[PDB]
């Protein structure tokens, strides 16, 4: 009964260690506050020269004219506002009844539509109000076209079409794309949070750069070490709980066997080889931090192949994980020795 | 009887945590950051996230009028007749009239008279040196619209000393500080305002102006789930405490119908949850339930994800429409009803 | 009994200060000046400029002397120091033997005549007497005259209007000169508390550019006073419980006074400012939020309830009178 | 008694550790470093030559990066309509690597995975340059002229035309995004070129870390560092003194080994060794380097001042006494041999423990 | 009683009630004050620092052991400023740079001698006045050996000197509130009353030294005294006609605003004339008498 | 009573240490330093002269470094086909050092090791200048004109042609990479030239450390420092007071030591104006004999005449001085023939 806790606490440590990304880990450093970057697994280590000439912006349209209040209907007829963003996006049509044709009503109407833009009212002073509509996301492709059918007055007040001769709205903020170069390669992007340009890298743009600036990606084993230390300690605690029945015996024996009888596609085929040694009397593992760091420094990915493997069928944490789930399941050996 | 008093506290303590969680604004929360000491900003619920480019060319000023001439003391009456001072601010504000009797016609008396009137201005006396005194009158609030007109009827000497009317040929007072409005642009939109604490211009944002800006400056509003997470942690912990109190009373009031009803109902409510959003159960936003004693386990990591993805959606589950729908809503109703004078817990304790 | 009433009396005295309910703090944009406020200061941004600081006159002998021990005068004499500004003159006897720089110095300084004398060794075994006004400003500038010995007069005397003076003006008396919200102010001192109402303005240096002193409302002080008072009273009730006709009278009267409150303002009970009276014991419960609100809204109005006119009206006023009377010898 | 014998082993082993730590020649050639610029920094190993080194850095080492001149509408669609072989040829006497690229795997994804799984000393990646346009980019894993690439494809003219790079060629599909360059510096007016910005094969026993181009006159300073050797010597003295405490404890009358020949032999031998030292240098004795010996319990008193002096004067000479040739001569050498022999399975502690 | 006696002695210093602190606008100078300094802004200017004269042989020597003089001789060092001359015997055998150096230094004549190895096995004698200022500049003369005189002698007025002026003696030169002051030292405590002025560098622009009243010191003293006495009463309570007498007598004897208003006046109460009058004075006398060998404590 | 005699030695040795520490004349001539630039710094020893020193530094000292003009394809392959003798001759009246270099050891490796094991006041090393090309480099271990080298080889013309350096020679195999030069400074307007940038032989009792060329007017300041002497005196007083506690612990041979130490501190004499230990602030208790140190008065006496205090405490170091005679007595009591070694038997 009390050895369900021991096993679940260990299960957690084991899940934490069963992440391939630990073994491709890299950290980052930037020479400017102008940008920063986080990496995921399998990022390529090196100095990246970065230049940033333009930041991405989100379009914001604003009524050219003002109004004496927010309660009074602009339109004397029912009408349909149609918002059309760019980039192969379907248009959204919103009904605006006459009575809901006030700045308040238009605002709420737009916002409740969940159409990828946001509407809000600006009090510009002297009891005068402007409607303002901004695209939720930055980039040329998210710029808007607004049109109204039904009421000429509303259309005349709110409409925007770049190609049109006269527009009721004014471009307050121009939609624009981020424009950078990374290792002398021109990149354009919708967003200042660029995660689809460079592989396994999220690049965060904050300001235009000046001069020669660099993002550095370096190998990082610290994360994988912590995971391995916590795992070793969690297992050693589980063995203490055993010390403190055939169902217990089966779990204790199987876990011992699994850690003893390992298979691996890398050069590292046993725990010892990567620092961790197995005390013959108890079963409990004793990590050597020096010899572990070495193995990781030499071939981090190779260590990963032992600990994680393919994640589905192979790898220590994989097979232990499968066994723990099965023991802790409703049909498992533990739920039967409960009943 | 003592046991029932304890239960009430445990239920009331949980009621508090539940009230605290039942605020929609938690799920639209945003924090702010400014590139200059020149201005700062707090937000309320439902502020729109983004980079705001702000420019500030003028700050709001409050008009200050000052007597053009001085006086040899503060005790000696200026007027030899009773008179009425009338202060008229701008902006569709009603005028205020103040009686000033002759004997109270001294700088002291005029000052006290004005200040006790609570007429939206403040009077004070300035000793400018060499035993010479000036009266000074300033509008309590900044902006063009709070600028003053002062007039006195009754004594020509007082009027001649104190009066101010912009349109007049000769005035007794002098404009020491000109009333002016705050003048800024926010994302290339010209905004004028009475105050340097601007909360009526941009929606759900209070903008605090400190100084004129120089160069390109920005106010940044970013989503903030931290406040909602704290609320949800406290709630989970309060409930888990309540269950401990049930157990303490169960293994004392072993089988009280009234305790059993409350324990069973709370369990059901949290189990059979429903929502307008995609998050239809507490488990989907990262809260798991111990199948035996009913306690809640919170996975902070998993909750932060769900909030980062669709904060408003999580809000729909926890808070709902606030009247009829939402976990905290229906728990709140139940708690009120149990803790009310016609409720079951008094019904139990009265019995004793 | 006595401890539990005197400890509460202290908390009550501390709360019975009107200034708590008019408090203001300050902030300055420069080290060039700073300001403290007392009660009833007017909140706002004050634009300050400072073009000249106040100086204190310092006169110094034009000639030097070979030592400090040797008498300058061969006759008994009277030094008369006359500051400006409607100040009475001070006359000091200087006997011949005490006519040395040492003697003149001590003579002046012991006279406590609003100036200070000192001897300056300017080098090469040569000494000058120097006399400075204790306070800054044009009005504290000096006139020095001696009657009795022509040599001493010739060495020490100063009169602006005079053709030849023995003393020299080392530092000119001058007034502080500032503007506060575009109003020219002149002052004797760099600690200016008589110009602007309820404000002490401390001048440190000449300003440059546009600078400001800001006065803002401050309720924190009043809250602390009210919390300490509530806690002191709750402790007194614990002492009653722990412990009669004399005790009963004090316990009943205090309860009544807090229950049966008067006021000039819109706050007529403790409830309205978020102090609720516990029926079961008499104890005050303190909601810190509701109190802060009431103070933010109308601090002066709360003050009217708690302090009143200070003499006859106000909670702390009437409690204070009762406590004094109970703790008195009669 | 088994336990009495057990404490002795722990004691002797604790001292053995301190002795092993002291038995490193490098301690007595230790040097620290200091740089006048963030532009570079340096660590030293044993036997580095002390002095001011003037350093100039005119170019940093770079790794070549080639990038397709043209873009593609997606990453899934095969470029080549025939099976082909990509051959990557780095410079510097490196064998070429050939990779099979089947038509179906001829997409930017496939070419990328193909290159990266080949483990050919370069790395491939895809760059989305915007507007749904993709470029392949290939960078050498290591910096320097010698690691620059030549790419060629045989089999599909389209692929070759799209991906190939040969500096000597008239038309190339790839473009040089970053030029391979060697690090270029001078150290005390001597021109040095290098593949890497972590230079450990140019100057002896020094690893020079280049961070940026220098400006003006900059210097790296190497200084003697006796601190490391002093700590080692303090720990060793303290460990031995503790061992003597354990002897005393184990024999007074905790006490069970009073009389034991095996303890007596170890105590006597160690005392003799430290008393009867020999050395190829001026320093023939522990007393000469600051360590005296109480003549009744044999504990050693370290005078830290005197030691620092002796080290400052002739660090290598002290080293001769403590470490010697490391095999046959030196205090720590002969003690180390004795400890190994006493703690071995055929040694004299086991024989006595077996005996119990 | 002894712990309280300490606190009482600490409070019985008149200077506490005339105390002043200082503040300078520059690292170029700083100042400490003693009792009775005059409060105010002092405008200070510093145009020259004080320097100490240093004379150095114009010629060098091949070593430090070899006698310069072939005859016994007398070195006479004469500083300025109404100072008596010092004569030092230098025997021939002690006529080496070593011997002259030791000879001078052991004389304790207000200068210091040392030997400078200027390179290439060449040595110069150097003599510097221990204190800065024009008045401490030297005259050196030798009678007995023409060679030594010719090598070592210095006289400003002389046509040819063996020594050279390496560092010129100069006086500190400043103005304090537009009053020219000259001084021997850069630690000036004899110019302005109750003020020690420390010169560090020449000033530039308008600088100021500010002296302000410091009641803080007196307050601390008074707080510590009150606390020490209150502790003594606790010790009485925790505890004979001897204790009773001390407790009763101390009681009888005793039976920021005030300091800001009239610090000196407060001082009159606490300290008085220091000999016969003042609280701390009479308590101090009683404590000494109780704690003495003949007192009410010993018996 | 075996362990009893052990403690009586145990406390006497601890006191002996404190007494040795106090018996250093330099304590009473101490000075600290302060520099206006990172360009130089200075430490002082005993008897430095206090004052402002104006220092200027126009040139730093350098150590010669010679480097082969030509390179080699590896470090293993012999340059010379015959046995030869390398002779290193530094300047300044230094004897030459000759090193045997056999043909098989004629490689850059071998020449390097050969030079370095010779301990000839230079250091050899190999520089990989790139592209698998190696240069030998030889640098003088100390800076200055006088430590510049002449290299010559007899035996093999090829080696000579590759490695030799002689300033006066027409053609040399080595090149001057760094020129030997002298430090050049002025200290209080006195020109000083020196071999080293760690100058301890120029100015008396001062070690001057040169780091960089100076600009503008800079100064080194030497000021009196009594703090070191005070610490020594406090530690000594405390050590003696501990010893008296150990005597008490053993009373409440010993008698002789306790009485003698008391007498020695009581009947004090000196060459200085100071004779008695009370004169300098260390007063005594007429109960047990302990010393009560009054830190204020000690500092005063040291500030007034540090050297004079030193005369009392240290004296001539051989025959006279408190610490001197106490030291002699302690050594004699703790010796193999003494009082403490004899009682135990």
GROMACS .gro file of N, CA and C in nm, chain F residues 117-190:
model
  222
 1793UNK      N    1   6.660   2.183  -1.977
 1793UNK     CA    2   6.719   2.102  -1.869
 1793UNK      C    3   6.854   2.157  -1.823
 1794UNK      N    4   6.917   2.236  -1.910
 1794UNK     CA    5   7.046   2.298  -1.878
 1794UNK      C    6   7.039   2.399  -1.766
 1795UNK      N    7   6.920   2.455  -1.741
 1795UNK     CA    8   6.899   2.560  -1.641
 1795UNK      C    9   7.007   2.666  -1.659
 1796UNK      N   10   7.005   2.724  -1.778
 1796UNK     CA   11   7.102   2.822  -1.823
 1796UNK      C   12   7.047   2.964  -1.825
 1797UNK      N   13   6.935   2.987  -1.756
 1797UNK     CA   14   6.878   3.121  -1.749
 1797UNK      C   15   6.804   3.167  -1.872
 1798UNK      N   16   6.775   3.075  -1.961
 1798UNK     CA   17   6.682   3.102  -2.070
 1798UNK      C   18   6.583   2.988  -2.075
 1799UNK      N   19   6.480   3.007  -2.154
 1799UNK     CA   20   6.376   2.906  -2.175
 1799UNK      C   21   6.349   2.890  -2.322
 1800UNK      N   22   6.342   2.767  -2.367
 1800UNK     CA   23   6.322   2.739  -2.507
 1800UNK      C   24   6.178   2.692  -2.522
 1801UNK      N   25   6.118   2.719  -2.636
 1801UNK     CA   26   5.991   2.655  -2.668
 1801UNK      C   27   5.964   2.652  -2.818
 1802UNK      N   28   5.872   2.566  -2.859
 1802UNK     CA   29   5.842   2.545  -2.998
 1802UNK      C   30   5.710   2.609  -3.031
 1803UNK      N   31   5.708   2.686  -3.139
 1803UNK     CA   32   5.585   2.751  -3.180
 1803UNK      C   33   5.540   2.695  -3.312
 1804UNK      N   34   5.416   2.645  -3.313
 1804UNK     CA   35   5.352   2.599  -3.435
 1804UNK      C   36   5.284   2.716  -3.502
 1805UNK      N   37   5.348   2.772  -3.604
 1805UNK     CA   38   5.302   2.899  -3.666
 1805UNK      C   39   5.193   2.878  -3.772
 1806UNK      N   40   5.152   2.752  -3.787
 1806UNK     CA   41   5.053   2.714  -3.883
 1806UNK      C   42   5.105   2.638  -4.003
 1807UNK      N   43   5.016   2.558  -4.059
 1807UNK     CA   44   5.040   2.486  -4.181
 1807UNK      C   45   5.152   2.386  -4.159
 1808UNK      N   46   5.149   2.326  -4.040
 1808UNK     CA   47   5.245   2.222  -4.006
 1808UNK      C   48   5.388   2.272  -4.012
 1809UNK      N   49   5.408   2.392  -3.960
 1809UNK     CA   50   5.537   2.454  -3.963
 1809UNK      C   51   5.574   2.502  -3.825
 1810UNK      N   52   5.696   2.473  -3.785
 1810UNK     CA   53   5.739   2.494  -3.648
 1810UNK      C   54   5.860   2.588  -3.638
 1811UNK      N   55   5.862   2.672  -3.537
 1811UNK     CA   56   5.976   2.758  -3.509
 1811UNK      C   57   6.023   2.734  -3.369
 1812UNK      N   58   6.152   2.747  -3.348
 1812UNK     CA   59   6.206   2.740  -3.214
 1812UNK      C   60   6.212   2.880  -3.166
 1813UNK      N   61   6.192   2.900  -3.038
 1813UNK     CA   62   6.197   3.034  -2.982
 1813UNK      C   63   6.271   3.023  -2.851
 1814UNK      N   64   6.359   3.117  -2.823
 1814UNK     CA   65   6.436   3.118  -2.699
 1814UNK      C   66   6.430   3.256  -2.630
 1815UNK      N   67   6.387   3.257  -2.504
 1815UNK     CA   68   6.368   3.381  -2.431
 1815UNK      C   69   6.441   3.381  -2.301
 1816UNK      N   70   6.495   3.498  -2.263
 1816UNK     CA   71   6.573   3.507  -2.142
 1816UNK      C   72   6.481   3.509  -2.025
 1817UNK      N   73   6.513   3.433  -1.922
 1817UNK     CA   74   6.423   3.421  -1.808
 1817UNK      C   75   6.398   3.548  -1.734
 1818UNK      N   76   6.492   3.643  -1.741
 1818UNK     CA   77   6.478   3.775  -1.677
 1818UNK      C   78   6.491   3.890  -1.774
 1819UNK      N   79   6.427   4.001  -1.743
 1819UNK     CA   80   6.424   4.114  -1.834
 1819UNK      C   81   6.551   4.193  -1.822
 1820UNK      N   82   6.583   4.268  -1.927
 1820UNK     CA   83   6.692   4.367  -1.922
 1820UNK      C   84   6.801   4.350  -2.026
 1821UNK      N   85   6.865   4.459  -2.064
 1821UNK     CA   86   6.973   4.457  -2.163
 1821UNK      C   87   7.081   4.353  -2.133
 1822UNK      N   88   7.115   4.344  -2.006
 1822UNK     CA   89   7.223   4.261  -1.962
 1822UNK      C   90   7.192   4.113  -1.978
 1823UNK      N   91   7.065   4.076  -1.986
 1823UNK     CA   92   7.028   3.934  -1.997
 1823UNK      C   93   7.003   3.887  -2.140
 1824UNK      N   94   7.032   3.973  -2.237
 1824UNK     CA   95   7.023   3.940  -2.378
 1824UNK      C   96   7.130   3.836  -2.410
 1825UNK      N   97   7.100   3.756  -2.511
 1825UNK     CA   98   7.173   3.634  -2.543
 1825UNK      C   99   7.265   3.644  -2.662
 1826UNK      N  100   7.367   3.559  -2.658
 1826UNK     CA  101   7.440   3.520  -2.776
 1826UNK      C  102   7.432   3.369  -2.786
 1827UNK      N  103   7.386   3.319  -2.900
 1827UNK     CA  104   7.383   3.176  -2.925
 1827UNK      C  105   7.485   3.134  -3.033
 1828UNK      N  106   7.558   3.029  -3.004
 1828UNK     CA  107   7.648   2.976  -3.104
 1828UNK      C  108   7.662   2.825  -3.090
 1829UNK      N  109   7.684   2.761  -3.204
 1829UNK     CA  110   7.691   2.619  -3.213
 1829UNK      C  111   7.819   2.585  -3.283
 1830UNK      N  112   7.889   2.486  -3.232
 1830UNK     CA  113   8.012   2.443  -3.295
 1830UNK      C  114   7.989   2.296  -3.321
 1831UNK      N  115   8.028   2.248  -3.438
 1831UNK     CA  116   8.010   2.107  -3.467
 1831UNK      C  117   7.930   2.086  -3.593
 1832UNK      N  118   7.818   2.154  -3.606
 1832UNK     CA  119   7.732   2.136  -3.721
 1832UNK      C  120   7.694   2.267  -3.786
 1833UNK      N  121   7.742   2.291  -3.907
 1833UNK     CA  122   7.715   2.416  -3.977
 1833UNK      C  123   7.563   2.442  -3.999
 1834UNK      N  124   7.486   2.335  -4.015
 1834UNK     CA  125   7.343   2.346  -4.041
 1834UNK      C  126   7.269   2.397  -3.921
 1835UNK      N  127   7.310   2.350  -3.804
 1835UNK     CA  128   7.243   2.387  -3.679
 1835UNK      C  129   7.278   2.531  -3.651
 1836UNK      N  130   7.408   2.562  -3.651
 1836UNK     CA  131   7.453   2.699  -3.636
 1836UNK      C  132   7.374   2.795  -3.725
 1837UNK      N  133   7.357   2.754  -3.849
 1837UNK     CA  134   7.294   2.836  -3.954
 1837UNK      C  135   7.147   2.860  -3.928
 1838UNK      N  136   7.091   2.767  -3.852
 1838UNK     CA  137   6.948   2.766  -3.817
 1838UNK      C  138   6.916   2.839  -3.688
 1839UNK      N  139   7.004   2.827  -3.589
 1839UNK     CA  140   6.980   2.869  -3.449
 1839UNK      C  141   7.066   2.984  -3.396
 1840UNK      N  142   7.178   3.011  -3.458
 1840UNK     CA  143   7.272   3.099  -3.395
 1840UNK      C  144   7.227   3.241  -3.393
 1841UNK      N  145   7.265   3.312  -3.288
 1841UNK     CA  146   7.246   3.456  -3.283
 1841UNK      C  147   7.365   3.526  -3.225
 1842UNK      N  148   7.416   3.624  -3.298
 1842UNK     CA  149   7.516   3.716  -3.247
 1842UNK      C  150   7.491   3.855  -3.304
 1843UNK      N  151   7.454   3.950  -3.216
 1843UNK     CA  152   7.420   4.087  -3.259
 1843UNK      C  153   7.521   4.140  -3.362
 1844UNK      N  154   7.649   4.118  -3.334
 1844UNK     CA  155   7.756   4.172  -3.416
 1844UNK      C  156   7.775   4.099  -3.549
 1845UNK      N  157   7.710   3.984  -3.565
 1845UNK     CA  158   7.729   3.899  -3.684
 1845UNK      C  159   7.657   3.955  -3.805
 1846UNK      N  160   7.711   3.926  -3.923
 1846UNK     CA  161   7.650   3.970  -4.051
 1846UNK      C  162   7.516   3.897  -4.077
 1847UNK      N  163   7.520   3.765  -4.070
 1847UNK     CA  164   7.401   3.683  -4.091
 1847UNK      C  165   7.371   3.595  -3.968
 1848UNK      N  166   7.247   3.596  -3.923
 1848UNK     CA  167   7.208   3.517  -3.809
 1848UNK      C  168   7.092   3.429  -3.847
 1849UNK      N  169   7.083   3.314  -3.783
 1849UNK     CA  170   6.975   3.221  -3.810
 1849UNK      C  171   6.854   3.264  -3.730
 1850UNK      N  172   6.880   3.316  -3.613
 1850UNK     CA  173   6.771   3.370  -3.531
 1850UNK      C  174   6.744   3.518  -3.559
 1851UNK      N  175   6.627   3.557  -3.518
 1851UNK     CA  176   6.573   3.689  -3.545
 1851UNK      C  177   6.541   3.747  -3.408
 1852UNK      N  178   6.548   3.876  -3.391
 1852UNK     CA  179   6.506   3.930  -3.262
 1852UNK      C  180   6.358   3.961  -3.260
 1853UNK      N  181   6.278   3.879  -3.191
 1853UNK     CA  182   6.132   3.894  -3.191
 1853UNK      C  183   6.090   4.003  -3.094
 1854UNK      N  184   6.140   3.991  -2.971
 1854UNK     CA  185   6.134   4.095  -2.871
 1854UNK      C  186   6.277   4.142  -2.832
 1855UNK      N  187   6.300   4.271  -2.844
 1855UNK     CA  188   6.426   4.337  -2.805
 1855UNK      C  189   6.442   4.345  -2.656
 1856UNK      N  190   6.557   4.305  -2.605
 1856UNK     CA  191   6.584   4.328  -2.464
 1856UNK      C  192   6.580   4.479  -2.442
 1857UNK      N  193   6.511   4.525  -2.338
 1857UNK     CA  194   6.528   4.665  -2.297
 1857UNK      C  195   6.523   4.693  -2.143
 1858UNK      N  196   6.577   4.806  -2.095
 1858UNK     CA  197   6.567   4.841  -1.951
 1858UNK      C  198   6.446   4.926  -1.914
 1859UNK      N  199   6.397   4.905  -1.792
 1859UNK     CA  200   6.297   4.993  -1.730
 1859UNK      C  201   6.358   5.129  -1.716
 1860UNK      N  202   6.279   5.232  -1.746
 1860UNK     CA  203   6.324   5.371  -1.730
 1860UNK      C  204   6.219   5.458  -1.662
 1861UNK      N  205   6.253   5.506  -1.543
 1861UNK     CA  206   6.160   5.581  -1.464
 1861UNK      C  207   6.233   5.698  -1.401
 1862UNK      N  208   6.154   5.790  -1.343
 1862UNK     CA  209   6.209   5.890  -1.250
 1862UNK      C  210   6.128   5.886  -1.120
 1863UNK      N  211   6.196   5.895  -1.007
 1863UNK     CA  212   6.133   5.894  -0.877
 1863UNK      C  213   6.179   6.021  -0.808
 1864UNK      N  214   6.085   6.110  -0.778
 1864UNK     CA  215   6.118   6.243  -0.728
 1864UNK      C  216   6.228   6.310  -0.811
 1865UNK      N  217   6.201   6.323  -0.941
 1865UNK     CA  218   6.290   6.384  -1.038
 1865UNK      C  219   6.429   6.328  -1.045
 1866UNK      N  220   6.448   6.203  -1.002
 1866UNK     CA  221   6.578   6.136  -1.017
 1866UNK      C  222   6.566   6.022  -1.119
   0.00000   0.00000   0.00000
